[PDB]
Amino acid sequence: RPDFCELPADTGPCRVRFPSFYYNPDEKKCLEFIYGGCEGNANNFITKEECESTCA
């Protein structure tokens, strides 16, 4: 899997709360987090399904 899948969840600096998903390498699971709508990092998916096909 892509190296970016190991990056921590990052809500970024904005305040528009998008329920999102990130790959958690320790748990080997795509888990839910809040993304604030701007910046952050590549370990950031709009659905669990997208996260699982990219990082899992």
Which CATH number is 4's domain given? 4.10.410.10
Coil vs helix vs strand at 3: helix
- Resolution reading in Å: 1.9
- 3-class secondary structure, 49: helix
> Which residues form the domain of 3?
1-56
The set of residues, in sequence order, having a beta carbon less than 8 Å from that of 32 and lying 6+ positions away, is: 19, 20, 21, 48
Integer Cα distance of 36 and 20 in angstroms: 10
CA distance 27 to 19: 19
Q: Which residues contact 18 (CB under 8 A, 6 or more apart)?
A: 34, 35, 36, 37, 46
Cα 23–18–32 angle (5° rounding)? 30
Distance (Å, whole) CA 33 – CA 48: 11
Domain count, the chain: 1
